[PDB]
Amino acid sequence: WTATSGSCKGRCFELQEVGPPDCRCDNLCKSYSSCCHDFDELCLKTARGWECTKDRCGEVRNEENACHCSEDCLSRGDCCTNYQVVCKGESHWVDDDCEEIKVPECPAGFVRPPLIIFSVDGFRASYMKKGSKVMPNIEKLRSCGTHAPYMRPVYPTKTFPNLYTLATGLYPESHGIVGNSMYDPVFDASFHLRGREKFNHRWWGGQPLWITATKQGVRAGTFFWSVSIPHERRILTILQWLSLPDNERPSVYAFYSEQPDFSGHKYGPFGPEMTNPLREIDKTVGQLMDGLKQLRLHRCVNVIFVGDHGMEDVTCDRTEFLSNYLTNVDDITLVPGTLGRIRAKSINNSKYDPKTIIAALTCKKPDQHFKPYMKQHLPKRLHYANNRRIEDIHLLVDRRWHVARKPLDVYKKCFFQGDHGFDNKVNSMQTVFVGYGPTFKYRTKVPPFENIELYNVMCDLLGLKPAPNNGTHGSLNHLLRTNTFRPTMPDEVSRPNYPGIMYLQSEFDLGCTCDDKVENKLEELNKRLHTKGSTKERHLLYGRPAVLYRTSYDILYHTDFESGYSEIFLMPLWTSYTISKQAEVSSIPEHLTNCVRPDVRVSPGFSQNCLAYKNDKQMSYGFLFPPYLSSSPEAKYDAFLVTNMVPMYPAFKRVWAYFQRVLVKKYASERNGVNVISGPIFDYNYDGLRDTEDEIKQYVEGSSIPVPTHYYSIITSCLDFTQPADKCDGPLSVSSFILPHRPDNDESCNSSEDESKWVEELMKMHTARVRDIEHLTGLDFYRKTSRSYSEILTLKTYLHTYESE
Numbered sequence: 001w002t003a004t005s006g007s008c009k010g011r012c013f014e015l016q017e018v019g020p021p022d023c024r025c026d027n028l029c030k031s032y033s034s035c036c037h038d039f040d041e042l043c044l045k046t047a048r049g050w051e052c053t054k055d056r057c058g059e060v061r062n063e064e065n066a067c068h069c070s071e072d073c074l075s076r077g078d079c080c081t082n083y084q085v086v087c088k089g090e091s092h093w094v095d096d097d098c099e100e101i102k103v104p105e106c107p108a109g110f111v112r113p114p115l116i117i118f119s120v121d122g123f124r125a126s127y128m129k130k131g132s133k134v135m136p137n138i139e140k141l142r143s144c145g146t147h148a149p150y151m152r153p154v155y156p157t158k159t160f161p162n163l164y165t166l167a168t169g170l171y172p173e174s175h176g177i178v179g180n181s182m183y184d185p186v187f188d189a190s191f192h193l194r195g196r197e198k199f200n201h202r203w204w205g206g207q208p209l210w211i212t213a214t215k216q217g218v219r220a221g222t223f224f225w226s227v228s229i230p231h232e233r234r235i236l237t238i239l240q241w242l243s244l245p246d247n248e249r250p251s252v253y254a255f256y257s258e259q260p261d262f263s264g265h266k267y268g269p270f271g272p273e274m275t276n277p278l279r280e281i282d283k284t285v286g287q288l289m290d291g292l293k294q295l296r297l298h299r300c301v302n303v304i305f306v307g308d309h310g311m312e313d314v315t316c317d318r319t320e321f322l323s324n325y326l327t328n329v330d331d332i333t334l335v336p337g338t339l340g341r342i343r344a345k346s347i348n349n350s351k352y353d354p355k356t357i358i359a360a361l362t363c364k365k366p367d368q369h370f371k372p373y374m375k376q377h378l379p380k381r382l383h384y385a386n387n388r389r390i391e392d393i394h395l396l397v398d399r400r401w402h403v404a405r406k407p408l409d410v411y412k413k414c415f416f417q418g419d420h421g422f423d424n425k426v427n428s429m430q431t432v433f434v435g436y437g438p439t440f441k442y443r444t445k446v447p448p449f450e451n452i453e454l455y456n457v458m459c460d461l462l463g464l465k466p467a468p469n470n471g472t473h474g475s476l477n478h479l480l481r482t483n484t485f486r487p488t489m490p491d492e493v494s495r496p497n498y499p500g501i502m503y504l505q506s507e508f509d510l511g512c513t514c515d516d517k518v519e520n521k522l523e524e525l526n527k528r529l530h531t532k533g534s535t536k537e538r539h540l541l542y543g544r545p546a547v548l549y550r551t552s553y554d555i556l557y558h559t560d561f562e563s564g565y566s567e568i569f570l571m572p573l574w575t576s577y578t579i580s581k582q583a584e585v586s587s588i589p590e591h592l593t594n595c596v597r598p599d600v601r602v603s604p605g606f607s608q609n610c611l612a613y614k615n616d617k618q619m620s621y622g623f624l625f626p627p628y629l630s631s632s633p634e635a636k637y638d639a640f641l642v643t644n645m646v647p648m649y650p651a652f653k654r655v656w657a658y659f660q661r662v663l664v665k666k667y668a669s670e671r672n673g674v675n676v677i678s679g680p681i682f683d684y685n686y687d688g689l690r691d692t693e694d695e696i697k698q699y700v701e702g703s704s705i706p707v708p709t710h711y712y713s714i715i716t717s718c719l720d721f722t723q724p725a726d727k728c729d730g731p732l733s734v735s736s737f738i739l740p741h742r743p744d745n746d747e748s749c750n751s752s753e754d755e756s757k758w759v760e761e762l763m764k765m766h767t768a769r770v771r772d773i774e775h776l777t778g779l780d781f782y783r784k785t786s787r788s789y790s791e792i793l794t795l796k797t798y799l800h801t802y803e804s805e
């Protein structure tokens with residue numbers, strides 16, 4: 001109940017939201033149907049429109065007008081944005097030459113450059129080039145400022161998840177806005193686009209930028225705008241707030257446009273109807289920049305032009321129906337569209353079985369346009385599992401498609417030609433970033449980056465300490481002229497042991513065999529030198545990884561590879577080796593097919609055993625350093641050490657053996673040598689973080705050998721591929737993956753075919769950042785390069801996406 005009989009007199013677009021039942025005059029009062037009776041009359045004036053005309057110049061102030069052309073308007077801060085152009089012979093901002101802004105040029109009393117975030121819904125990255133002829137204001141911000149070719153959204157590529165990630169620096173699984181539609185089983189409550197449940201603060205986790213600012217004494221404008229407030233009025237309100245007294249004036253502001261998303265859904269991303277919305281957004285940017293120029297703020301404010309996601313061609317005829325796969329379609333609830341989330345219709349249905357639903361949706365039709373996943377099996381780069389609002393069953397929908405439960409859902413609710421929500425590496429989902437202002441760089445192109453990084457940067461721009469978030473603070477320092485964040489590398493928590501030869505062969509009762517009984521002072525000396533680390537410089541190019549948790553591990557050196565061997569998890573945490581462009585691939589010799597060799601540096605009590613693998617009828621083993629890439633027949637014996645062995649399902653070994661035998665040498669050929677770091681990951685609680693021992697759900701039968709959930713590899717080379725990876729003077733190039741350790745290849749519908757037809761497709765889907773591997777392992781890589789630490793942080797955030805232009 002609201003007492004709407006109160007008044008918005010002297011309260012229009014007030015920043016402090018007032019308590020029911022008192023009536024409101026803030027920019028969301030319309031959305032809560034709570035505005036005072038006179039809000040439209042006082043706060044949403046439209047009389048004479050939005051532009052000064054020659055006949056209005058020097059007019060007697062009429063308080064009824066939407067904006068003013070009277071001599072007093074600049075001091076009142078309520079001129080039409082074109083006032084000085086029409087009435088005082090000034091130029092539009094867009095007609096001024098670009099001039100580097102080296103320092104803030106602010107009015108007296110400004111304590112910091114304000115930040116204005118200009119957010120555009122559904123603004124696909126390629127609009128910056130394809131729409132450039134119709135967006136001159138945006139093209140000036142882009143060319144004169146700091147721009148990325150695109151910015152990667154979070155999954156799902158929906159509005160609320162992405163705007164709240166921009167606000168918080170968090171993945172949706174952490175901030176809790178995991179879709180535009182959600183059911184929380186603990187609250188027993190549903191969140192929807194339409195309705196009032198979404199205004200309950202219990203949905204929204206983390207600490208958004210406006211709260212971070214307010215808590216640190218930095219005032220914020222209200223970021224959300226009721227849809228009925230015209231864009232011109234949003235701009236004039238921001239310009240009016242910027243004219244407040246010093247003690248009252250916010251330092252951070254947001255503008256939001258529902259376009260071009262609104263038109264893109266109707267017409268498709270490149271429908272001819274899309275030109276006019278892009279022209280209208282550009283005109284709005286021009287109104288803001290002209291307005292700032294009038295207030296002498298156009299060389300004072302930092303401006304961010306940023307989108308939430310892109311837009312794909314999607315039509316009603318490209319819909320998959322679950323009714324074509326499931327017998328039981330009325331016993332499920334589907335969250336539908338550009339992703340699918342399935343749960344039981346009723347928690348009283350004891351016959352609901354996720355396993356039978358997954359099996360019924362798996363590789364059933366030759367051109368099937370979705371793939372089912374248990375959420376823990378989704379690519380780790382999506383960080384889309386650790387939230388009770390994310391249903392256990394997920395459908396990853398192909399670009400250009402929808403999934404629905406039954407056909408009547410599509411025609412009892414064709415219309416639309418555009419949609420978004422797909423995998424955040426899809427080119428059509430990419431969006432925009434431009435920064436313009438004293439704190440940003442001038443005429444600078446930066447590599448594409450992820451929207452989780454921008455919270456940290458917006459905190460840097462405002463002198464705020466960020467709340468804990470999923471950005472890597474310092475990874476975007478190359479966007480900034482000043483206010484860079486200069487972190488120190490994390491302290492190593494656990495120092496390695498360096499064991500020598502300490503055990504005789506007969507102390508080991510592992511059930512292993514090897515045909516290695518084969519008997520020289522020259523080469524005796526070399527073998528000893530290799531074990532002491534004589535080749536370590538070749539194979540550990542960037543220093544050993546630091547272990548950032550308390551554990552017991554050993555460094556083990558070999559001719560061809562170095563490892564950090566866990567005495568707790570009975571396997572390497574990491575295995576590092578370098579393969580030159582010239583490297584030769586060899587076989588596992590017949591006589592060594594089943595060879596496993598005790599490591600006389602490592603106690604039998606801290607070793608795996610072969611009998612466990614014999615007894616476990618599901619689990620086999622592989623090797624982290626590949627015997628295929630041995631430097632010599634003698635060095636090959638090292639690759640069969642029990643300390644190089646890891647548990648692998650036969651299905652996984654098909655992938656792993658093809659990676660090791662074919663793909664590593666292909667990458668060394670293509671990149672002029674590669675350095676590889678490989679290892680296990682344990683994430684049984686799907687939280688993206690290194691498991692403790694007590695979280696491990698599966699062991700090799702009858703043993704204490706834990707089974708990884710994933711295997712990673714980090715593949716590094718010289719960005720200048722004319723230099724070999726092991727003699728690189730400059731910046732590095734990385735690609736990584738986190739492959740799921742699964743007992744079948746059901747994810748790969750073509751897995752009956754030769755590994756050349758499906759293994760690389762799998763690896764591309766499970767591409768990763770080094771930072772994703774750092775979270776999952778508690779290791780810190782690249783500690784000893786001759787590169788800037790911020791450059792290394794940028795490298796650690798890189799994702800190799802495998803999308804064409």
Ligand SMILES: *[C@@H]1O[C@H](CO)[C@@H](O[C@@H]2O[C@H](CO)[C@@H](O[C@@H]3O[C@H](CO[C@H]4O[C@H](CO)[C@@H](O)[C@H](O[C@H]5O[C@H](CO)[C@@H](O)[C@H](O)[C@@H]5O[C@H]5O[C@H](CO)[C@@H](O)[C@H](O)[C@@H]5O)[C@@H]4O)[C@@H](O)[C@H](O[C@H]4O[C@H](CO)[C@@H](O)[C@H](O)[C@@H]4O[C@H]4O[C@H](CO)[C@@H](O)[C@H](O)[C@@H]4O)[C@@H]3O)[C@H](O)[C@H]2NC(C)=O)[C@H](O)[C@H]1NC(C)=O
Binds near residue numbers: 204
């Ligand atoms: C991305 O960045 C974020 C931010 O840094 C990282 O997330 C953090 O991860 C930490 C480890 O998972 C986590 O730490 C836990 O915090 C608990 C306190 O949590 C409350 O307070 C904080 C601070 O204000 C607040 O942010 C939290 O907000 C979460 O929860 C509310 C819902 O209640 C949500 O609205 C909000 O969206 C957010 O939810 C997200 O996180 C929770 C986990 O907190 C998930 O369950 C959600 O799905 C969602 O992902 C909270 O309001 C603290 O109690 C925990 O401590 C317990 O566990 C540790 C184990 O190490 C143990 O040592 C302690 O003894 C303690 O154990 C006791 O509780 C156990 C569980 O009940 C029980 O089993 C034991 O027996 C004991 O009784 C823990 O410290 C931190 O909260 C989140 N923060 C956020 C914002 O998500 C994230 O990891 C990064 N991602 C990657 C991939 O790097």
Ligand SMILES: Cc1cnc(N2Cc3cnc(N[C@@H]4Cc5ccc(Cl)cc5C4)nc3C2)nc1
Binds near residue numbers: 163164167223
């Ligand atoms: C179903 C549905 C979806 N979407 C919307 N719309 C209403 C609205 C109104 N205002 C905003 N303002 C945005 C919020 C935000 C967050 C971070 C940053 Cl950096 C800038 C901004 C500015 N966003 C929105 C989103 N409504 C309904």
Ligand SMILES: [Ca+2]
Binds near residue numbers: 121122160261309
């Ligand atoms: Ca959107």
Ligand SMILES: [Ca+2]
Binds near residue numbers: 683684686689
């Ligand atoms: Ca974990």
Ligand SMILES: [K+]
Binds near residue numbers: 613615616617618619
């Ligand atoms: K076995």
Ligand code: NA
Binds near residue numbers: 745
């Ligand atoms: Na298969």
Ligand SMILES: [Zn+2]
Binds near residue numbers: 122159261262265420
């Ligand atoms: Zn949309």
